[PDB]
Amino acid sequence: TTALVCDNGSGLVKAGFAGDDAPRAVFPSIVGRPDSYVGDEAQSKRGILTLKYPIEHGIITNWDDMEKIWHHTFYNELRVAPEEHPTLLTEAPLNPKANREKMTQIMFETFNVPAMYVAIQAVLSLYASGRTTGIVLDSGDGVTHNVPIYEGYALPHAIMRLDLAGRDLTDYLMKILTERGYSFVTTAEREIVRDIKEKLCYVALDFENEMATAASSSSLEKSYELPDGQVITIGNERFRCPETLFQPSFIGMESAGIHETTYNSIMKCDIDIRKDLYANNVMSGGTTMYPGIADRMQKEITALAPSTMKIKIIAPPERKYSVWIGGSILASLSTFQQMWITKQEYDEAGPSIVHRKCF
Numbered sequence: 115t116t117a118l119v120c121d122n123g124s125g126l127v128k129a130g131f132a133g134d135d136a137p138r139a140v141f142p143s144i145v146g147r148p149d150s151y152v153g154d155e156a157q158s159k160r161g162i163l164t165l166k167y168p169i170e171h172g173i174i175t176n177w178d179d180m181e182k183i184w185h186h187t188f189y190n191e192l193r194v195a196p197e198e199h200p201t202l203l204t205e206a207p208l209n210p211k212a213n214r215e216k217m218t219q220i221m222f223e224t225f226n227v228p229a230m231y232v233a234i235q236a237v238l239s240l241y242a243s244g245r246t247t248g249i250v251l252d253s254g255d256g257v258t259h260n261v262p263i264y265e266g267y268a269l270p271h272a273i274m275r276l277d278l279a280g281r282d283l284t285d286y287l288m289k290i291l292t293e294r295g296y297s298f299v300t301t302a303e304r305e306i307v308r309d310i311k312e313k314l315c316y317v318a319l320d321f322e323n324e325m326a327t328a329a330s331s332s333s334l335e336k337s338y339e340l341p342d343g344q345v346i347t348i349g350n351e352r353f354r355c356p357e358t359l360f361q362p363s364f365i366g367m368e369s370a371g372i373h374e375t376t377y378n379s380i381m382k383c384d385i386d387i388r389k390d391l392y393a394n395n396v397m398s399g400g401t402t403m404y405p406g407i408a409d410r411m412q413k414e415i416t417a418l419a420p421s422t423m424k425i426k427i428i429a430p431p432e433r434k435y436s437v438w439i440g441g442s443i444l445a446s447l448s449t450f451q452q453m454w455i456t457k458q459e460y461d462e463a464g465p466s467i468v469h470r471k472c473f
Protein backbone atom coordinates (compact mmCIF):
# COMPACT_ATOMS: atom_id res chain seq x y z
CA THR A 115 0.00 0.00 0.00
CA THR A 116 3.07 2.31 -0.01
CA ALA A 117 2.59 5.39 -2.24
CA LEU A 118 4.32 5.62 -5.60
CA VAL A 119 6.18 8.64 -6.93
CA CYS A 120 6.64 8.96 -10.67
CA ASP A 121 8.67 11.94 -11.96
CA ASN A 122 7.93 12.18 -15.69
CA GLY A 123 10.75 13.95 -17.56
CA SER A 124 11.41 14.81 -21.19
CA GLY A 125 14.46 12.52 -21.21
CA LEU A 126 14.17 10.27 -18.14
CA VAL A 127 11.45 8.78 -15.98
CA LYS A 128 12.42 8.57 -12.29
CA ALA A 129 10.06 6.34 -10.29
CA GLY A 130 9.85 4.53 -7.01
CA PHE A 131 8.23 4.41 -3.61
CA ALA A 132 7.48 7.19 -1.19
CA GLY A 133 9.92 7.12 1.70
CA ASP A 134 12.73 5.67 -0.37
CA ASP A 135 15.86 7.83 -0.71
CA ALA A 136 16.26 7.45 -4.49
CA PRO A 137 14.10 6.26 -7.38
CA ARG A 138 14.43 2.50 -7.97
CA ALA A 139 13.55 2.98 -11.67
CA VAL A 140 15.36 5.43 -13.96
CA PHE A 141 14.87 4.88 -17.68
CA PRO A 142 14.57 6.89 -20.91
CA SER A 143 11.25 8.49 -21.76
CA ILE A 144 11.08 6.85 -25.16
CA VAL A 145 8.76 4.54 -27.06
CA GLY A 146 10.33 2.67 -29.95
CA ARG A 147 8.94 0.97 -33.05
CA PRO A 148 10.59 -1.11 -35.86
CA ASP A 149 4.81 -4.09 -31.47
CA SER A 150 6.40 -1.39 -29.29
CA TYR A 151 9.33 -1.14 -26.87
CA VAL A 152 9.59 1.23 -23.93
CA GLY A 153 12.56 2.67 -22.08
CA ASP A 154 15.70 0.51 -21.86
CA GLU A 155 14.09 -1.98 -24.29
CA ALA A 156 14.01 0.77 -26.93
CA GLN A 157 17.51 2.20 -26.20
CA SER A 158 19.50 -1.06 -26.24
CA LYS A 159 17.86 -2.10 -29.54
CA ARG A 160 19.54 0.76 -31.44
CA GLY A 161 19.20 1.88 -35.07
CA ILE A 162 16.41 -0.35 -36.36
CA LEU A 163 13.92 1.45 -34.06
CA THR A 164 12.52 4.94 -34.67
CA LEU A 165 11.85 6.71 -31.36
CA LYS A 166 9.00 8.85 -30.06
CA TYR A 167 9.37 11.11 -27.03
CA PRO A 168 5.98 11.49 -25.34
CA ILE A 169 7.12 14.42 -23.17
CA GLU A 170 8.28 17.47 -25.07
CA HIS A 171 9.91 20.34 -23.16
CA GLY A 172 8.45 18.97 -19.95
CA ILE A 173 4.84 18.66 -21.15
CA ILE A 174 3.12 15.37 -21.93
CA THR A 175 2.13 15.64 -25.62
CA ASN A 176 1.61 12.04 -26.83
CA TRP A 177 -0.95 10.54 -24.49
CA ASP A 178 -1.11 7.01 -25.87
CA ASP A 179 2.66 6.60 -25.72
CA MET A 180 2.65 8.22 -22.27
CA GLU A 181 0.28 5.46 -21.13
CA LYS A 182 2.85 2.96 -22.40
CA ILE A 183 5.51 4.68 -20.31
CA TRP A 184 3.30 4.53 -17.21
CA HIS A 185 2.46 0.88 -17.88
CA HIS A 186 6.17 0.09 -18.23
CA THR A 187 6.84 1.95 -14.95
CA PHE A 188 4.26 0.09 -12.89
CA TYR A 189 4.48 -3.38 -14.39
CA ASN A 190 8.03 -3.86 -15.80
CA GLU A 191 10.16 -1.57 -13.58
CA LEU A 192 8.43 -1.42 -10.16
CA ARG A 193 6.38 -4.66 -10.41
CA VAL A 194 3.31 -3.20 -8.70
CA ALA A 195 -0.42 -3.20 -9.19
CA PRO A 196 -1.41 0.46 -9.59
CA GLU A 197 -4.81 -0.23 -7.98
CA GLU A 198 -3.13 -0.88 -4.62
CA HIS A 199 -1.02 2.34 -4.43
CA PRO A 200 -1.71 6.07 -4.14
CA THR A 201 0.34 7.62 -6.93
CA LEU A 202 2.01 11.04 -6.97
CA LEU A 203 2.83 12.30 -10.46
CA THR A 204 4.94 15.34 -11.28
CA GLU A 205 4.26 18.06 -13.85
CA ALA A 206 6.09 20.97 -15.35
CA PRO A 207 5.65 24.51 -14.13
CA LEU A 208 2.75 26.16 -16.03
CA ASN A 209 1.39 22.79 -17.15
CA PRO A 210 -2.03 23.44 -18.73
CA LYS A 211 -5.03 22.73 -16.53
CA ALA A 212 -6.47 20.37 -19.21
CA ASN A 213 -3.20 18.45 -19.15
CA ARG A 214 -3.29 17.91 -15.42
CA GLU A 215 -6.96 16.87 -15.82
CA LYS A 216 -5.97 14.30 -18.44
CA MET A 217 -3.21 12.87 -16.22
CA THR A 218 -5.84 12.48 -13.50
CA GLN A 219 -8.39 10.87 -15.85
CA ILE A 220 -5.82 8.35 -17.05
CA MET A 221 -4.61 7.38 -13.58
CA PHE A 222 -8.16 6.67 -12.38
CA GLU A 223 -9.80 5.23 -15.55
CA THR A 224 -6.88 3.35 -17.15
CA PHE A 225 -4.81 2.39 -14.11
CA ASN A 226 -7.54 2.36 -11.43
CA VAL A 227 -5.36 3.97 -8.76
CA PRO A 228 -7.03 4.41 -5.34
CA ALA A 229 -5.73 7.97 -5.03
CA MET A 230 -3.38 10.34 -6.84
CA TYR A 231 -1.90 13.82 -6.83
CA VAL A 232 0.02 16.00 -9.29
CA ALA A 233 2.82 18.25 -7.98
CA ILE A 234 5.00 20.83 -9.71
CA GLN A 235 8.52 19.53 -10.26
CA ALA A 236 10.47 22.62 -9.26
CA VAL A 237 8.45 22.90 -6.07
CA LEU A 238 9.38 19.36 -5.12
CA SER A 239 13.04 20.13 -5.68
CA LEU A 240 12.85 23.07 -3.32
CA TYR A 241 11.29 20.80 -0.67
CA ALA A 242 14.11 18.27 -1.14
CA SER A 243 16.56 21.01 -0.09
CA GLY A 244 14.61 21.57 3.15
CA ARG A 245 13.05 24.81 2.05
CA THR A 246 9.58 26.19 1.42
CA THR A 247 10.82 29.60 0.16
CA GLY A 248 13.34 30.09 -2.62
CA ILE A 249 13.79 30.23 -6.36
CA VAL A 250 14.52 27.04 -8.28
CA LEU A 251 16.45 26.77 -11.51
CA ASP A 252 15.30 23.40 -12.90
CA SER A 253 17.04 22.27 -16.07
CA GLY A 254 16.74 18.76 -17.50
CA ASP A 255 16.84 17.21 -20.95
CA GLY A 256 14.00 19.21 -22.53
CA VAL A 257 13.26 22.42 -20.68
CA THR A 258 14.58 24.94 -18.18
CA HIS A 259 12.45 26.85 -15.71
CA ASN A 260 12.92 29.53 -13.08
CA VAL A 261 10.27 29.04 -10.35
CA PRO A 262 10.02 31.38 -7.36
CA ILE A 263 8.24 29.80 -4.40
CA TYR A 264 6.95 31.42 -1.21
CA GLU A 265 5.90 29.53 1.91
CA GLY A 266 5.52 26.32 -0.11
CA TYR A 267 3.70 27.65 -3.20
CA ALA A 268 4.95 28.62 -6.63
CA LEU A 269 4.24 32.17 -7.80
CA PRO A 270 2.95 31.42 -11.32
CA HIS A 271 3.07 34.98 -12.64
CA ALA A 272 6.84 35.04 -12.09
CA ILE A 273 7.73 31.68 -13.65
CA MET A 274 10.13 31.80 -16.62
CA ARG A 275 10.65 29.10 -19.25
CA LEU A 276 13.55 28.48 -21.66
CA ASP A 277 13.19 25.69 -24.27
CA LEU A 278 16.90 25.03 -24.06
CA ALA A 279 18.24 22.21 -21.94
CA GLY A 280 20.30 19.02 -22.08
CA ARG A 281 19.24 17.58 -25.43
CA ASP A 282 20.05 20.92 -27.14
CA LEU A 283 23.48 20.90 -25.50
CA THR A 284 24.15 17.37 -26.69
CA ASP A 285 22.95 18.36 -30.18
CA TYR A 286 25.27 21.37 -30.15
CA LEU A 287 28.28 19.29 -29.09
CA MET A 288 27.34 16.79 -31.80
CA LYS A 289 27.33 19.60 -34.36
CA ILE A 290 30.70 20.93 -33.19
CA LEU A 291 32.32 17.50 -33.30
CA THR A 292 30.70 16.64 -36.67
CA GLU A 293 32.23 19.84 -38.08
CA ARG A 294 35.65 18.90 -36.67
CA GLY A 295 35.43 15.74 -38.81
CA TYR A 296 33.87 13.05 -36.60
CA SER A 297 30.85 10.88 -37.50
CA PHE A 298 28.05 11.29 -34.90
CA VAL A 299 24.54 10.87 -36.36
CA THR A 300 22.72 7.74 -35.10
CA THR A 301 21.04 7.42 -31.67
CA ALA A 302 23.96 5.24 -30.49
CA GLU A 303 26.30 8.04 -31.56
CA ARG A 304 24.06 10.54 -29.71
CA GLU A 305 24.61 8.47 -26.58
CA ILE A 306 28.38 8.76 -27.01
CA VAL A 307 28.28 12.55 -27.41
CA ARG A 308 25.92 12.82 -24.38
CA ASP A 309 28.56 10.96 -22.41
CA ILE A 310 31.36 13.24 -23.56
CA LYS A 311 29.19 16.21 -22.53
CA GLU A 312 28.52 14.80 -19.09
CA LYS A 313 32.12 13.77 -18.42
CA LEU A 314 34.16 16.63 -19.92
CA CYS A 315 32.05 19.79 -20.17
CA TYR A 316 32.10 22.58 -17.60
CA VAL A 317 30.93 26.19 -17.20
CA ALA A 318 33.63 28.86 -17.30
CA LEU A 319 33.54 31.54 -14.61
CA ASP A 320 34.57 34.08 -17.22
CA PHE A 321 33.89 32.90 -20.76
CA GLU A 322 36.14 35.43 -22.52
CA ASN A 323 39.07 34.62 -20.20
CA GLU A 324 38.60 30.92 -20.67
CA MET A 325 38.51 31.28 -24.48
CA ALA A 326 41.84 33.13 -24.22
CA THR A 327 43.36 30.41 -22.05
CA ALA A 328 42.30 27.69 -24.47
CA ALA A 329 43.73 29.69 -27.41
CA SER A 330 47.15 30.01 -25.74
CA SER A 331 47.77 26.70 -23.99
CA SER A 332 46.80 23.06 -23.99
CA SER A 333 45.98 23.12 -20.26
CA LEU A 334 42.21 22.83 -20.83
CA GLU A 335 42.42 19.93 -23.28
CA LYS A 336 40.88 16.66 -22.08
CA SER A 337 40.71 13.35 -23.86
CA TYR A 338 37.93 10.80 -24.20
CA GLU A 339 38.14 7.14 -25.21
CA LEU A 340 35.48 6.22 -27.79
CA PRO A 341 33.77 2.79 -27.71
CA ASP A 342 36.33 1.28 -30.19
CA GLY A 343 39.36 2.62 -28.29
CA GLN A 344 40.17 5.61 -30.57
CA VAL A 345 40.70 8.91 -28.73
CA ILE A 346 39.07 12.30 -29.19
CA THR A 347 40.43 15.49 -27.62
CA ILE A 348 38.43 18.62 -26.89
CA GLY A 349 39.43 21.95 -25.35
CA ASN A 350 37.25 24.99 -25.72
CA GLU A 351 34.24 22.79 -26.75
CA ARG A 352 34.22 21.73 -23.10
CA PHE A 353 32.97 25.11 -21.95
CA ARG A 354 31.47 26.50 -25.20
CA CYS A 355 28.83 23.81 -25.07
CA PRO A 356 27.21 24.73 -21.71
CA GLU A 357 27.95 28.45 -22.27
CA THR A 358 24.86 28.22 -24.49
CA LEU A 359 22.75 28.24 -21.28
CA PHE A 360 24.06 31.77 -20.62
CA GLN A 361 24.23 32.76 -24.34
CA PRO A 362 21.41 31.04 -26.21
CA SER A 363 22.51 32.84 -29.36
CA PHE A 364 25.20 30.12 -29.70
CA ILE A 365 22.48 27.84 -31.12
CA GLY A 366 20.50 30.61 -32.81
CA MET A 367 17.94 31.25 -30.06
CA GLU A 368 16.93 34.87 -29.32
CA SER A 369 16.22 34.17 -25.63
CA ALA A 370 17.73 35.61 -22.48
CA GLY A 371 20.19 33.25 -20.75
CA ILE A 372 19.50 31.42 -17.50
CA HIS A 373 21.08 34.12 -15.32
CA GLU A 374 18.87 36.76 -16.92
CA THR A 375 15.73 34.61 -16.60
CA THR A 376 16.59 33.99 -12.93
CA TYR A 377 16.93 37.71 -12.27
CA ASN A 378 13.84 38.55 -14.33
CA SER A 379 11.84 36.02 -12.31
CA ILE A 380 12.93 37.52 -9.01
CA MET A 381 12.04 40.99 -10.33
CA LYS A 382 8.51 39.83 -11.07
CA CYS A 383 8.10 38.98 -7.36
CA ASP A 384 7.08 41.24 -4.50
CA ILE A 385 10.01 43.43 -3.49
CA ASP A 386 9.50 42.30 0.13
CA ILE A 387 10.38 38.66 -0.64
CA ARG A 388 13.30 39.16 -3.01
CA LYS A 389 15.96 39.03 -0.29
CA ASP A 390 14.79 35.53 0.58
CA LEU A 391 14.81 34.45 -3.09
CA TYR A 392 18.35 35.78 -3.68
CA ALA A 393 19.60 33.89 -0.62
CA ASN A 394 17.86 30.65 -1.65
CA ASN A 395 18.57 29.94 -5.34
CA VAL A 396 18.37 26.15 -5.62
CA MET A 397 19.58 24.27 -8.70
CA SER A 398 17.72 21.15 -9.81
CA GLY A 399 18.03 18.77 -12.74
CA GLY A 400 20.77 17.05 -14.71
CA THR A 401 21.71 20.08 -16.78
CA THR A 402 22.72 21.90 -13.59
CA MET A 403 25.43 19.27 -12.99
CA TYR A 404 28.18 21.04 -14.95
CA PRO A 405 31.20 21.86 -12.81
CA GLY A 406 31.38 25.61 -12.41
CA ILE A 407 27.70 26.38 -12.99
CA ALA A 408 26.86 27.40 -9.41
CA ASP A 409 29.81 29.80 -9.23
CA ARG A 410 28.96 31.26 -12.60
CA MET A 411 25.35 31.81 -11.55
CA GLN A 412 26.55 33.43 -8.35
CA LYS A 413 28.68 35.91 -10.31
CA GLU A 414 26.05 36.73 -12.88
CA ILE A 415 23.28 37.23 -10.34
CA THR A 416 25.64 39.37 -8.22
CA ALA A 417 26.24 41.55 -11.26
CA LEU A 418 22.53 42.18 -11.66
CA ALA A 419 21.26 42.26 -8.07
CA PRO A 420 21.31 45.18 -5.61
CA SER A 421 24.53 45.64 -3.75
CA THR A 422 25.32 43.62 -0.72
CA MET A 423 22.08 41.41 -1.15
CA LYS A 424 23.33 38.11 0.01
CA ILE A 425 23.32 35.84 -3.04
CA LYS A 426 23.46 32.11 -2.31
CA ILE A 427 23.37 29.36 -4.94
CA ILE A 428 22.56 25.92 -3.49
CA ALA A 429 23.61 23.03 -5.72
CA PRO A 430 22.69 19.79 -3.91
CA PRO A 431 24.88 16.82 -5.00
CA GLU A 432 21.66 14.79 -5.36
CA ARG A 433 20.10 17.28 -7.77
CA LYS A 434 19.68 14.81 -10.66
CA TYR A 435 17.01 13.24 -8.38
CA SER A 436 15.82 16.29 -6.37
CA VAL A 437 12.37 16.40 -7.92
CA TRP A 438 11.80 12.72 -7.19
CA ILE A 439 13.14 13.04 -3.65
CA GLY A 440 10.85 15.99 -2.93
CA GLY A 441 7.93 13.85 -4.06
CA SER A 442 9.08 10.97 -1.90
CA ILE A 443 9.16 13.32 1.11
CA LEU A 444 5.84 15.02 0.37
CA ALA A 445 3.94 11.81 -0.25
CA SER A 446 5.26 10.35 3.06
CA LEU A 447 4.01 13.16 5.31
CA SER A 448 1.07 12.58 7.65
CA THR A 449 -0.25 16.03 6.78
CA PHE A 450 -0.27 15.15 3.05
CA GLN A 451 -2.64 12.21 3.33
CA GLN A 452 -5.71 14.47 3.41
CA MET A 453 -4.47 15.99 0.14
CA TRP A 454 -4.65 12.94 -2.12
CA ILE A 455 -7.46 12.99 -4.69
CA THR A 456 -9.35 9.77 -3.87
CA LYS A 457 -11.17 7.66 -6.46
CA GLN A 458 -14.39 8.47 -4.54
CA GLU A 459 -13.72 12.22 -4.83
CA TYR A 460 -13.07 11.79 -8.58
CA ASP A 461 -16.31 9.83 -9.09
CA GLU A 462 -18.26 12.50 -7.21
CA ALA A 463 -16.97 15.56 -9.10
CA GLY A 464 -15.05 14.19 -12.12
CA PRO A 465 -11.49 14.87 -13.42
CA SER A 466 -11.98 18.64 -12.70
CA ILE A 467 -11.55 17.92 -8.97
CA VAL A 468 -7.81 18.27 -9.73
CA HIS A 469 -8.10 22.11 -9.82
CA ARG A 470 -9.46 22.24 -6.27
CA LYS A 471 -6.80 19.82 -4.86
CA CYS A 472 -3.59 20.39 -6.92
CA PHE A 473 -1.56 23.15 -8.63
Ligand SMILES: CO[C@H]([C@H](C)/C=C/N(C)CO)[C@@H](C)C(=O)CC[C@H](C)[C@H](C[C@@H]1OC(=O)C[C@@H](O[C@H](N)O)C[C@H](C)C[C@H](O)[C@H](C)[C@@H](OC)c2coc(n2)-c2coc(n2)-c2coc(n2)/C=C/C[C@H](OC)[C@H]1C)OC
Pocket residue numbers: 132133134135136233234237240241242243244245246265266267268432439440442443444446447449450473
Ligand atom coordinates in the same frame (compact mmCIF):
# COMPACT_ATOMS: atom_id res chain seq x y z
C1 LIG B 1 2.06 19.41 2.97
O1 LIG B 1 2.32 20.27 1.86
C2 LIG B 1 2.18 21.70 1.99
C3 LIG B 1 1.16 22.20 0.95
C4 LIG B 1 -0.26 21.87 1.40
C5 LIG B 1 1.47 21.74 -0.44
C6 LIG B 1 1.81 22.74 -1.28
N1 LIG B 1 2.14 22.36 -2.61
C7 LIG B 1 2.37 21.01 -3.05
C8 LIG B 1 2.44 23.38 -3.50
O2 LIG B 1 2.73 23.21 -4.68
C9 LIG B 1 3.58 22.29 1.79
C10 LIG B 1 3.55 23.78 2.07
C11 LIG B 1 4.64 21.75 2.71
O3 LIG B 1 4.36 21.57 3.90
C12 LIG B 1 5.74 20.96 2.08
C13 LIG B 1 6.80 20.53 3.05
C14 LIG B 1 8.02 19.89 2.40
C15 LIG B 1 7.72 18.55 1.78
C16 LIG B 1 9.14 19.67 3.42
C17 LIG B 1 8.77 18.83 4.64
C18 LIG B 1 9.95 18.53 5.55
O4 LIG B 1 10.99 17.89 4.78
C19 LIG B 1 12.20 18.47 4.68
O5 LIG B 1 12.49 19.57 5.11
C20 LIG B 1 13.03 17.74 3.68
C21 LIG B 1 14.45 17.71 4.21
O6 LIG B 1 14.64 17.05 5.48
C22 LIG B 1 15.26 17.75 6.50
N2 LIG B 1 14.93 17.05 7.64
O7 LIG B 1 15.46 18.97 6.54
C23 LIG B 1 15.45 17.04 3.28
C24 LIG B 1 16.93 17.28 3.45
C25 LIG B 1 17.50 18.62 3.71
C26 LIG B 1 17.82 16.41 2.60
C27 LIG B 1 17.72 14.91 2.55
O8 LIG B 1 17.80 14.44 3.91
C28 LIG B 1 18.66 14.18 1.61
C29 LIG B 1 18.40 14.64 0.19
C30 LIG B 1 18.57 12.65 1.56
O9 LIG B 1 18.97 12.27 2.87
C31 LIG B 1 19.41 10.93 3.08
C32 LIG B 1 17.27 12.01 1.28
C33 LIG B 1 16.89 11.43 0.10
O10 LIG B 1 15.60 11.03 0.28
C34 LIG B 1 15.19 11.52 1.53
N3 LIG B 1 16.20 12.08 2.18
C35 LIG B 1 13.89 11.11 1.95
C36 LIG B 1 12.85 10.41 1.37
O11 LIG B 1 11.79 10.51 2.27
C37 LIG B 1 12.18 11.34 3.36
N4 LIG B 1 13.40 11.73 3.11
C38 LIG B 1 11.11 11.70 4.23
C39 LIG B 1 9.88 11.08 4.35
O12 LIG B 1 9.38 11.91 5.34
C40 LIG B 1 10.39 12.75 5.81
N5 LIG B 1 11.52 12.72 5.11
C41 LIG B 1 10.05 13.72 6.83
C42 LIG B 1 10.94 14.69 7.07
C43 LIG B 1 10.64 15.72 8.11
C44 LIG B 1 10.77 17.17 7.60
O13 LIG B 1 10.84 18.30 8.51
C45 LIG B 1 12.16 18.74 8.78
C46 LIG B 1 9.60 17.51 6.65
C47 LIG B 1 8.38 17.96 7.43
O14 LIG B 1 9.62 20.93 3.90
C48 LIG B 1 10.50 21.65 3.05
Ligand SMILES: Nc1ncnc2c1ncn2[C@@H]1O[C@H](COP(=O)(O)OP(=O)(O)OP(=O)(O)O)[C@@H](O)[C@H]1O
Pocket residue numbers: 122123124125126127171172253254255256257258279280281308311312313398399400401402403404434
Ligand atom coordinates in the same frame (compact mmCIF):
# COMPACT_ATOMS: atom_id res chain seq x y z
N1 LIG C 1 26.99 15.40 -15.17
C1 LIG C 1 26.18 15.96 -16.08
N2 LIG C 1 26.61 17.08 -16.73
C2 LIG C 1 25.84 17.70 -17.67
N3 LIG C 1 24.59 17.24 -17.98
C3 LIG C 1 24.14 16.14 -17.34
C4 LIG C 1 24.91 15.47 -16.41
N4 LIG C 1 24.17 14.43 -15.97
C5 LIG C 1 22.98 14.41 -16.63
N5 LIG C 1 22.97 15.47 -17.50
C6 LIG C 1 21.88 15.80 -18.41
O1 LIG C 1 20.70 15.95 -17.64
C7 LIG C 1 19.64 15.63 -18.51
C8 LIG C 1 18.69 14.74 -17.72
O2 LIG C 1 18.25 15.48 -16.56
P1 LIG C 1 16.82 15.29 -15.87
O3 LIG C 1 16.50 13.87 -15.52
O4 LIG C 1 16.75 16.28 -14.83
O5 LIG C 1 15.88 15.71 -17.10
P2 LIG C 1 14.35 15.33 -17.42
O6 LIG C 1 13.55 15.39 -16.14
O7 LIG C 1 14.35 14.08 -18.19
O8 LIG C 1 13.98 16.53 -18.41
P3 LIG C 1 13.10 17.90 -18.25
O9 LIG C 1 13.11 18.25 -16.77
O10 LIG C 1 13.84 18.86 -19.13
O11 LIG C 1 11.76 17.51 -18.75
C9 LIG C 1 20.20 15.00 -19.79
O12 LIG C 1 20.22 15.97 -20.85
C10 LIG C 1 21.58 14.64 -19.35
O13 LIG C 1 22.55 14.55 -20.40
Ligand SMILES: [Ca+2]
Pocket residue numbers: 122123124235254399437
Ligand atom coordinates in the same frame (compact mmCIF):
# COMPACT_ATOMS: atom_id res chain seq x y z
CA1 LIG D 1 12.53 17.06 -14.90
